[PDB]
Amino acid sequence: IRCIGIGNRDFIEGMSGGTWVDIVLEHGGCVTVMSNNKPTLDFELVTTTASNMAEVRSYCYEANISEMASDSRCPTQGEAYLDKMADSQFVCKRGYVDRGWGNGCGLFGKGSIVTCAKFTCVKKLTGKSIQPENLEYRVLVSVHASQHGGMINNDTNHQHDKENRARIDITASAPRVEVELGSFGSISMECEPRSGLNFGDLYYLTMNNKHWLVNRDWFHDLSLPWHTGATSNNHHWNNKEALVEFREAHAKKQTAVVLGSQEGAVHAALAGALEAESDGHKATIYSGHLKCRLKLDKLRLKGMSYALCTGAFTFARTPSETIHGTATVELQYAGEDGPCKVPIVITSDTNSMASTGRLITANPVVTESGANSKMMVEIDPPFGDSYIIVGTGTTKITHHWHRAGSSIGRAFEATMRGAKRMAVLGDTAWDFGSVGGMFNSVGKFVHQVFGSAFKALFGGMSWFTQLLIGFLLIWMGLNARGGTVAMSFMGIGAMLIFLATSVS
Amino acid sequence: IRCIGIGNRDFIEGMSGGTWVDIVLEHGGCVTVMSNNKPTLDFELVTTTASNMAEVRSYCYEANISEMASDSRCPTQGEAYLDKMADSQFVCKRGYVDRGWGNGCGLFGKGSIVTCAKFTCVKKLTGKSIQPENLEYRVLVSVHASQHGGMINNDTNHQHDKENRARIDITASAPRVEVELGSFGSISMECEPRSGLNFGDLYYLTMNNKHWLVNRDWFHDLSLPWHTGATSNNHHWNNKEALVEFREAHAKKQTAVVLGSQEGAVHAALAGALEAESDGHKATIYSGHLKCRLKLDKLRLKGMSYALCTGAFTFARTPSETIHGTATVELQYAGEDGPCKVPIVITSDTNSMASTGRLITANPVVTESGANSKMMVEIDPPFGDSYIIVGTGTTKITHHWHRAGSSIGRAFEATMRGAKRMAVLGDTAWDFGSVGGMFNSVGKFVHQVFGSAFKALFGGMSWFTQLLIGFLLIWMGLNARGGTVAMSFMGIGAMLIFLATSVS
Amino acid sequence: IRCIGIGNRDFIEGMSGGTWVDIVLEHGGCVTVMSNNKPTLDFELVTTTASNMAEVRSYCYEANISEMASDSRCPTQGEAYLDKMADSQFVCKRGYVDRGWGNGCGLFGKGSIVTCAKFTCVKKLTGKSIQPENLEYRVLVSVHASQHGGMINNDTNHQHDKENRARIDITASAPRVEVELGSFGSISMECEPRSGLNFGDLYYLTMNNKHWLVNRDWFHDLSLPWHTGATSNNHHWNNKEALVEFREAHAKKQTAVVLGSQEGAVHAALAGALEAESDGHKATIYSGHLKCRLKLDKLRLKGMSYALCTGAFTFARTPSETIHGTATVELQYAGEDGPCKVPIVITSDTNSMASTGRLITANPVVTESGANSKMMVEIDPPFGDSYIIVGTGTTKITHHWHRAGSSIGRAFEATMRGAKRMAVLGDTAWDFGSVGGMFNSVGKFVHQVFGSAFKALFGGMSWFTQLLIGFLLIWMGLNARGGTVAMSFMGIGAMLIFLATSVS
Amino acid sequence: VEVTKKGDTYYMFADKKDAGKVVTFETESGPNRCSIQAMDIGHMCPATMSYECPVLEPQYEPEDVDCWCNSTAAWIVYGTCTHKTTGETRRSRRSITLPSH
Amino acid sequence: VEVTKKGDTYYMFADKKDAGKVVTFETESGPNRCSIQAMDIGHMCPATMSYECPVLEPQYEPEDVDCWCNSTAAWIVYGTCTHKTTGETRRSRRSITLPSH
Amino acid sequence: VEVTKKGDTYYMFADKKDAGKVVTFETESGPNRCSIQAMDIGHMCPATMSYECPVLEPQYEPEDVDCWCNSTAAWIVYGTCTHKTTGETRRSRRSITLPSH
Amino acid sequence: SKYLIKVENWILRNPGYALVAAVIGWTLGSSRSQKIIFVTLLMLVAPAYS
Amino acid sequence: SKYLIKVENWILRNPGYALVAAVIGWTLGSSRSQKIIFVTLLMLVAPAYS
Amino acid sequence: SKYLIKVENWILRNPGYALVAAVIGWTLGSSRSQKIIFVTLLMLVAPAYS
Ligand SMILES: *[C@@H]1O[C@H](CO)[C@@H](O)[C@H](O)[C@H]1NC(C)=O
Ligand SMILES: *[C@@H]1O[C@H](CO)[C@@H](O)[C@H](O)[C@H]1NC(C)=O
Ligand SMILES: *[C@@H]1O[C@H](CO)[C@@H](O)[C@H](O)[C@H]1NC(C)=O
């Protein structure tokens, strides 16, 4: 039920006999996977986790100085000398100053003056690199089990039945994971962290308990003191003159000064930069998509063998409507019959009693055996006016529903979305290895690209007339001697035969 | 035996009746000379010796100064003067400095100041020239006398029988030398030190007990004090201002300073230079080839008249194989029969007993009359598999041997090497003087260029069939009226007749 | 005689009856004007004089300051104010400085500080403009009066007979001048100062008793204090901040400093500039040519009526030769006959006695009546060998002379020079006013362009044969029906008739 | 030092000798002790630097200030030249350059 | 002020209180009277400015010099901070700017 | 210091100890007090700097001169080396470079 | 809008009878546009029998 | 390699008989290439009589 | 050089006789170049009668 209130929601349906199915997950969206006999699953990607990041360079915005010393020699004495020059922690500058009898020596000529002082970095910021083997994605998996749908369980402490929700950590070391959903069964996932945001031109900047991302060509352009890329208590700094300002000149000395806090300059320069969050030493990124392949072999239903409900069904409120034309129904059941299957139908008139639409949640069931229990389901009503009927006998309730739009419009939108998805799945879509899965791959993707329109167009899914139409179309394409008219017709005929062979 | 372990080894064979023979010696290789009735000789060039080298120029890298003096005159007094100006050991510089009442005289103008100081060269390096008449080459001559072949005699102190090895000093004064090999006989050598490394654009640089070679166009380009080679206690120097730095400008004086040791600069500049070694005043060069002509008139064998060995022959170890496809055999003889000829044959099968290959060492013999003695020989096995048999009677021993490659390949390689050698021998190859030696010269070089293939190709050296083939080829070339078919055929026929007339 | 030693010397000859004649004077050359009955004149241009030049702008390189004052206000007080701001002689600058409790007031914000000081220009340079009405040219006029030719009279104090030399000041106000040469007569000159060096893109820079000329497109580009030319004791300056360097603002003050003498910078920038000289307020320029027109109406000879010399003539030295093939002869006369005409002839042989050349100095005469007097003359010998004869009777002296070159070569060179001169005389060459002077103008310039070749080519100046040649050429051109052959021939015939009608 | 008043404002003519020492004078409020810490003070000559230095509370120590009095704000003035040679320091060393041509 | 010698050179530990006054000490040559005109002198704290100030003849006036003694050249050292708050003045106001992106 | 005369000219052999002090000697004119302000003076050793220092009138201050006597011009000479180790300073640091090849 | 979706859903519910009616009305027009009008007539009267 | 050197040495040992066999087998082919195959056959069978 | 200037000056001294000789020698040649040679002959022999 985690996929209900999401703006960017898709719909993926696989072949009836097709166990494998590929999907793409975006960091701001969700994916709903449904089948004929398998329960509906909902996949979401929460956060990109970066851990164990190496350090490349650290800059020092605010620094201090101490023990300023200077030494002056006038002409015919050579260059000035100081013992602290050989020390790596003391920075000095040389210069030439005018001298005379007022300064101690007689010959009038410019003298050599040197001035150095210590350098201590009181505050600093750091830059880290990001390697593909360090990334770790987190995906939550939910199951439509006719849950109550109440938002009271925000954290992961409790109120989360381990058979209804799960979390999976996809790492670059082992991309193959086995997910256990308890009574529902087990699934397999193989995710490939590719075609994401480039991490070869990005540096993770940590500064004053805040974090940003910067460009590598800009990080080296910054004009501040910097050290070598090693972990040392005290490291040989470089280009520290940019933080120590020397006066013009003096006949006997030179007084250096240190610049103030450069935090404001960095905050102003990083205005148009991306931000992130961090916990301890790990970082969280909210950008990046993922491609995955799911194997659904041991996944089954939970209430397929249950009986019918012989109690009283009642609406809890007016059924709401989502942006994707899906209707959520919240039912309250009275009686003590235990877990029983919920008899619900969608038709065009109260006397017709003919299924006209499909259900997003397969096998709606009540979870507890209480007297007055509650449950929720999600369905897809047909375009136009429709009637939802719940229950049997003289106690069955009916409700009117309306939905705007057109079937052809939705079909074309879904076809375009599937084409865009298949275009995103450029690599790792087919397999050119052992033979026997190539035809399976071409059938699988033609299904994933055309089934949304096949189900919407070809009548009431009789599975008998469509085969005859395909046969007659193949015959019409066969008895044609002209070029470019038999190949396309036979291809379309085979496509329709295969799409009818799959689940409708 | 000095020519066994050499990578660059050649093989020279002369005409049967041809006494004179030309050779070329490289400083990194060896030459083996063999004949039909003459013992095998081995020539090598050890070192190029340069002695009595003249001196051209000497530089002074590190220098000292002392007794600095200066003299200043202000305007309306003329040029400054000092008594030490006329001395060649004192260098001074002139200049103009601003003067006033503070400096002694009244008029406000700039004056003339001069400053000189002594110059003493504490350390210096020297440059020598190399003349062709100073060079002296050293060539060692060894004789294959079935020596033990032990490498225990490295120097020239002892363990070198004077009848088996010799040393020759080829000088530019007398290029004709007569070599005495004791019982073997005497030979004559005429060597021409030509086409060697050019010594007209090279200078021998001596510095700090080390030596180098430099270019003449670069030696004069160096910017340092210098003086030519004149035997004296005190030398006059030129361009010494490059080592004495004067200060800017002072009204009453000028303090000069001397530069430090420039040994590091010279060591850095001479990084990509060639090096050598020296002993006392002589120098050793390891580059340069030589051309020689040998006259072998009084050279004979030593054990041609000896009898056969009726003792016991045994192998001392597995016979080794060199890079040139030559096989060394180390034999141990038991018995007391005195110096006797070693009966050894090379065949294809134990029952064939037919000589199929040649011997690099002519007339293998035992040197001493001891009970258990040892000896060594070097042979050339035929391509493929072969059997070496030593001794006669029921005590003869046999050994299997194999050698890869092809006879045509070796023949072509030897022909190309002989062509390259004859191309190196550009001058002093033929004689255009008295007639009678021109045909001898053309026959000699066609032999030295084609005998390696003649012996390898034309059958089993029967000396009877080859004459008939030559006669029939001459006849076929004679009865042909067409052009360009009789000249080449007659030439090839005469070439083959001559090559069969010579030694095979 | 002022035109003898000049490299760029021309020769101008006018028509016999033609009084007016135009000439061009260059600042580095001379002009010689000769006629049949008029004495030879020599015109030269000495210096271009510029006076009464207006002032455009003045710069101040070295300046002083005094009475520096400042005023600072911190936030919640408004802008700073000072009474000296409204004064034009005090320059101030504003700024914003950080303040706090350490600086006097409470609120922690940055304030407004202003600082001004007086400005007094101790030394300055000036810029003047040059107008055409200010220029004044000076031309010296000499007369060939057989003067001694001694260079002992350099200045204008004495030793300059007022009838032999004169000076003329050509101004833009009155270009018409009347020259009096004493006994020789009077001439008229009309000079037009046009086509000279452009004075619309040049500024006359005066600095430290030195003077230069600069470009207007650089004079305004200089970044220094400046003020226009206004007669006053105290001037208002603009853009003086370029000479006063303000120290970084302190907590509540600002100390300004003044730059040193910028004379070195100006001397370095004016390295590639033109220089000149000045006297008082006038300037002297050595570049610029001039065009003039001379009217010779009242000019006559001085010794035309004198008698012959019956004394003794002698050479004073070997006659010299100038670059223009002219021969100077220095004669010494013995006897007391008073001013008498010098009988001199130029011929080809001592017995021929036929005038073959012309004289540059007309009517050579002796000036004094002394016993032993001296005189000088300048003649043009014919190409080849010639004899100069001086005197009559048995006391006449002869001298040989030789001159290389060819008559046709000199004729062509003079024709090309005359063509160049006529091309320089673009405007004011002809007159398009009243009729009657147009034919005079075309004849005058065709004469000035072709007479140098006419005199050199057409025989011995018989004045009788040339008319017959012209008549026959006119007849040959007349009896010709073909086009482009009668017009050119008739034109050349008329040209030759006119050139023969003039003086030869 | 000389103490005058021109237009209800006090001027303190301080020469070079009184450098780094305090001075007490009288104002309309009463006695005023004012300290002078002028570092760039020079000899007496026409080049005179003048700047107001302000009154401040005793508890707050001066900071980057070389003149302070406690009655009111006092304007200080003193010459700035070298060895009474009627010459300013003019040690700017800007070395302004001009275009060649 | 404290006067010590470490390696044949004299160090004068001068605090804030001794600012603008002379002091007499003893050297190997004899008595030495040395004047101190330190303008940027501060309180005692780790930030210590130290510079040798040279001997000169009394017949010359000091030029651009704030320390001079007459026995030899003497090395002066003094702290530079504000109100003993262990903080330097650091009033540079350079305001270095960085590229945006 | 030693004072000698060789050829009507006075030489003053001054060692390192007499550095910065005046000395009085006798000449044909009378007593002469001559001051020496040599800064780079060294110990006694073969490297000897010698330069004439001139007489001048006492009513003028010295401008660029470190030696001045008042009878005549006097030639001063003194060694220039370090710690009497028979070694000159030779601190030029020119570092002349040679072509490689 | 209000009626197009209804007839569209009706066609998609039982397309066989709809195609039968369409092919019946296709051959009952004198001109091409007349056949188009007749089949759109059947398309419009299809939802309500009345 | 292993057999080429053997047959080469055999040919070079007794070239007369080898050339006799070659000239005999040269004239026993119908075409040029057939003669070449026949002589290479003789070349190959030359080492071992069997 | 040495003789050209002399004959040139001679021609310029008395051009009538020179032109007479030139026009006389012009009509005594068989070809154009021959006439040119004959007139240059007269030009050269003009200075010295001999
Ligand atoms: C200024 O401060 C001094 C400090 O002792 C004090 O004596 C004087 O009275 C004060 N003047 C005032 C408050 O006007
Ligand atoms: C330094 O000068 C002072 C000035 O009074 C004097 O008392 C003292 O003796 C001098 N020290 C010397 C000469 O060593
Ligand atoms: C040099 O000057 C001193 C000044 O005290 C004087 O005593 C001495 O006599 C002078 N020497 C002369 C004039 O030779």
Residue numbers in the entry:
A (entry chain A), B (entry chain D), C (entry chain G): 1 to 504
D (entry chain H), E (entry chain B), F (entry chain E): 1 to 101
G (entry chain C), H (entry chain F), I (entry chain I): 120 to 169
Paper passage:
The surface of mature, infectious flaviviruses is composed of an icosahedral shell of 90 flat-lying envelope (E) protein dimers, the main target of humoral immunity. In contrast to their mature counterparts, immature virions possess 60 protruding spike-like trimers of precursor membrane (prM)-E complexes (prM3E3). The pr domain of prM binds to E, obscuring the fusion peptide and thereby preventing unproductive fusion within the already infected cell. When immature virions reach the low-pH environment of the trans-Golgi network (TGN), the trimeric prM3E3 spikes rearrange into the flat-lying conformation, characteristic of the mature virus.
To better grasp maturation, we carry out cryo-EM reconstructions of immature Spondweni virus (SPOV), a human flavivirus of the same serogroup as ZIKV. Our samples contained a mixture of mature and immature particles (black and white arrows, respectively). By only selecting immature particles we were able to obtain a reconstruction at 7.8 Å resolution. The map shows the overall architecture of the spike-like trimers and extended areas of exposed membrane around the threefold and fivefold vertices. At 7.8 Å resolution, the interpretability of a map is limited. We propose that translations of glycoproteins in the immature-mature transition make use of the available space in the membrane at the five- and threefold vertices to reposition the proteins. Indeed, such translational fluctuations may explain the difficulties in achieving high resolutions in cryo-EM of immature flaviviruses.
